[PDB]
Amino acid sequence: IAALVVDNGSGMCKAGFAGDDAPRAVFPSIVGRPRHQGVMVGMGQKDSYVGDEAQSKRGILTLKYPIEHGIVTNWDDMEKIWHHTFYNELRVAPEEHPVLLTEAPLNPKANREKMTQIMFETFNTPAMYVAIQAVLSLYASGRTTGIVMDSGDGVTHTVPIYEGYALPHAILRLDLAGRDLTDYLMKILTERGYSFTTTAEREIVRDIKEKLCYVALDFEQEMATAASSSSLEKSYELPDGQVITIGNERFRCPEALFQPSFLGMESCGIHETTFNSIMKCDVDIRKDLYANTVLSGGTTMYPGIADRMQKEITALAPSTMKIKIIAPPERKYSVWIGGSILASLSTFQQMWISKQEYDESGPSIVHRKC
Amino acid sequence: IAALVVDNGSGMCKAGFAGDDAPRAVFPSIVGRPRHQGVMVGMGQKDSYVGDEAQSKRGILTLKYPIEHGIVTNWDDMEKIWHHTFYNELRVAPEEHPVLLTEAPLNPKANREKMTQIMFETFNTPAMYVAIQAVLSLYASGRTTGIVMDSGDGVTHTVPIYEGYALPHAILRLDLAGRDLTDYLMKILTERGYSFTTTAEREIVRDIKEKLCYVALDFEQEMATAASSSSLEKSYELPDGQVITIGNERFRCPEALFQPSFLGMESCGIHETTFNSIMKCDVDIRKDLYANTVLSGGTTMYPGIADRMQKEITALAPSTMKIKIIAPPERKYSVWIGGSILASLSTFQQMWISKQEYDESGPSIVHRKC
Amino acid sequence: IAALVVDNGSGMCKAGFAGDDAPRAVFPSIVGRPRHQGVMVGMGQKDSYVGDEAQSKRGILTLKYPIEHGIVTNWDDMEKIWHHTFYNELRVAPEEHPVLLTEAPLNPKANREKMTQIMFETFNTPAMYVAIQAVLSLYASGRTTGIVMDSGDGVTHTVPIYEGYALPHAILRLDLAGRDLTDYLMKILTERGYSFTTTAEREIVRDIKEKLCYVALDFEQEMATAASSSSLEKSYELPDGQVITIGNERFRCPEALFQPSFLGMESCGIHETTFNSIMKCDVDIRKDLYANTVLSGGTTMYPGIADRMQKEITALAPSTMKIKIIAPPERKYSVWIGGSILASLSTFQQMWISKQEYDESGPSIVHRKC
């Protein structure tokens, strides 16, 4: 039967059948619960809201993301999200459909084991497999060589791969992501005067970040231009009806990816981490990695990200070196596209973790096929 | 049919049909194996890489030279290299083509026997023969009299030959070669500050040695000039993009051939060994050997080698003696050219080890025709 | 006057007067700088923190080790550390006290020259000298014959010495050290679930490595026992108050010294490098080297290191050979003890680089007395 590919990263759970060029169902990986006791008795009130329903009733619900950073903070909530995906979004019984999932590199095998145990004892799927997100991104890009810098809403990692073999010793994982960028946008918005403190407020700030933020090419000159000419100002309309005028915040919210000193973490920026991962590899395969850097995730859509990354990595890297920042469209769903390609490949169909193999061995079987 | 001449010395396996003035196929005698478990499943991954493919994927492979010094360290790897030569480089089935090989003098007949057994039980070649490399060099030089100082990447040997008869009692074999020179270049490069420790790094250092090193005429004055004027400095571009400035190393890397005290071996230099081999022969045939010294191998290309050898051998040898250091171009492939000439000669065509003779006698047949 | 011996290796700068059996002052070779702009104005805030003060304020400082591998990455920071050693730790004006230092073998004379220039133009010490660390370790061990395998926080090198003369042609330097082991401990800790990414986090991980890691005698059986019985688990208390339970990490963090394939470097393990250095020497002095192997450095304290090294070197070395792994206590300060012994020796007192000799010749004087 047709295998199912589900990517729970990038803040929004994207799932669909293998082979398609786009995911069938996409929605935020969000679980909502009521905050006030209701008075309506005739109206059907459900104890928990998941995904699009929780988004619709965002104003009167508490929102908890199950996936934090790259680890699970509420296995009950993630089980609820998976049930929603399998029964209310894709409309397919997992009892007869093999499933494929994604997980960020350098993640607890405690998390991986709970993932496998949930999917095998709750949904009893005939087969299962767990793959690295950025490897799937490289699958989607087609090329079999080149560093992939994935940066979802929870994780920011790079896994350089050369000529068919990965480089597990050069994997760098970084914490700055969509959630941290949203938090910085919160802080800078209350700096301007618009105070946001609520899960609903957080989602509105995330929408503002998606639809207004961009990365400059030279931060100092951009800041001076925005503070002097005041021509970069843009407006946004909140659901309450009050307009928000945003100035320096546009290129200060996503500047933390390159200057994490704004958020205070000592870790170097995304470009510096990519460059360090490049130098961590062998001295001979450096140029092919330079020429085939791939971006993905949900925190890469920003305008000018490719130009800024190219400029910074050119400044860091030695001269006489061509660094083509491959940033194709659909980076948001590139991970899912790669997962679909991997599941559709016939050779990979034999490397799955079958139910019989699971019942025979268990946790070992799962950290032995990854 | 056309006989095949294969020279596995000089670090790079050179093979081709007999009669041609240049070898048909040349490539490093190198075998590569993956160092990291791959993640790509669709991409065709082969367990072993040999020759040019291993050179192309040098950065993510472990490289082991089968031929060490002048002896085989991995018969499986050399069988793989021979299979590559016979099927993927020369594109000729050995089942109907006689084969000729080369071997350094003073080499284990255990090695020779394993060579013959491999080539007769694996490739089932109708006929076979093993010859001395430097005798082939003398064949290529045309002259039927004169010491040949061969120095490949593994061996450095001289076999004086006079008027059609060799001198087995004056054969001197020395260990300094391309591998030792590359190791000394490694040590002096980490002395300067560029640390190299990898097989890929070793191959890059070998390339640097080929394209930058040269032999001076007076070591002390050259060292003083390079340390004072700093006009001998040259730059090189690594595949990673970092330039390397090389000073005294240029004429210190190949100076070990004349002053092996740098590498610590008590054995005298190449010129001193040549002179000793000259005096080891008869008192009457000394002058013809002096006037017809022949160089060959892959560690002789260096600039100024002929001038330095001439000066040193003139200082060592008595006066009123003309020592013409015959150093023709194509010394790198001179061994193969001589092998092709020997195989093309019609008189030599009867001194081959046929398959029937092998099956009749074996090891004896092979140390009885050499 | 009493000469001063300063060892800047092993990650922690150890210095003190010559003749003493223990160093007077010891502290990490660490320089700290503020990460956030302060608000306190009355409190005395200094621009840079060095050594113990930086360790005390580790949580709010950025920590950069001046000595990287075996080379200097910030001469200003190392000058600051030396000033701290000379004025705030040993409390002695270097204007009237000769100084002795240590440096790993196969190190850039650019680094050595900057060392000498700093110490002669900044501290104007009447005399100076630079010695090899592992030779000092052999001095401390007393024996005048036997390979010393030094492995500090930056370098891992062996310099076989026989009957009063060193063997410069058999010196093998390896990059695996305390910093690499700490990095592997970081990776395996975020593998378990405890993510560490900060200089403070790195220092905490280094402390955990010091106080919890050990080397097994058979890696496969130890891994099986730890994964099955779960009796090797140990706990640690972070300064934040959260306990850390560590299992396989205990003997996986220092297993990289013997199986560097875990960190991905192609270089062979410490035991294999020691064995290779043993075979690199003369065929007659091999047994005395075997019977007198000496360990030192700050990455040797681990439990079971001597037993594992003895087993591995016995397996590698031929039989009927006694390999006594001499691992005396105080290996951490053995280098400094040897330096103190060398400075206290009266014969060595004439081989110093005086200030007049420096002003007369310079860089040459310094690479001519080493």
XYZ file of N, CA and C in Angstrom, chain C residues 271-272 275 290 308-319 321 323:
54
model
N 47.085 3.815 21.599
C 47.898 2.610 21.727
C 48.554 2.245 20.401
N 47.807 2.361 19.300
C 48.374 2.044 17.996
C 49.481 3.021 17.624
N 52.541 2.029 19.581
C 53.149 0.848 18.977
C 53.888 1.196 17.689
N 59.880 -0.872 25.078
C 58.697 -1.619 25.490
C 58.601 -1.694 27.006
N 44.231 -0.986 30.135
C 43.802 -1.067 28.742
C 44.978 -0.884 27.792
N 45.861 0.073 28.089
C 47.033 0.278 27.252
C 47.931 -0.949 27.260
N 48.124 -1.559 28.431
C 48.950 -2.756 28.511
C 48.357 -3.885 27.685
N 47.045 -4.102 27.796
C 46.411 -5.174 27.033
C 46.533 -4.929 25.534
N 46.242 -3.701 25.093
C 46.278 -3.411 23.663
C 47.695 -3.501 23.110
N 48.678 -2.971 23.839
C 50.047 -2.999 23.349
C 50.618 -4.409 23.423
N 50.103 -5.249 24.327
C 50.512 -6.647 24.337
C 49.936 -7.386 23.138
N 48.675 -7.111 22.802
C 48.082 -7.722 21.620
C 48.812 -7.291 20.353
N 49.178 -6.011 20.263
C 49.849 -5.513 19.065
C 51.288 -6.010 18.982
N 52.018 -5.949 20.093
C 53.426 -6.293 20.101
C 53.614 -7.806 20.028
N 54.780 -8.260 19.569
C 55.045 -9.701 19.538
C 55.095 -10.286 20.939
N 54.871 -11.599 21.013
C 54.887 -12.307 22.286
C 56.302 -12.386 22.846
N 57.424 -10.722 25.163
C 57.816 -9.329 25.317
C 57.068 -8.741 26.501
N 55.816 -5.649 28.461
C 55.530 -4.228 28.303
C 54.976 -3.682 29.611
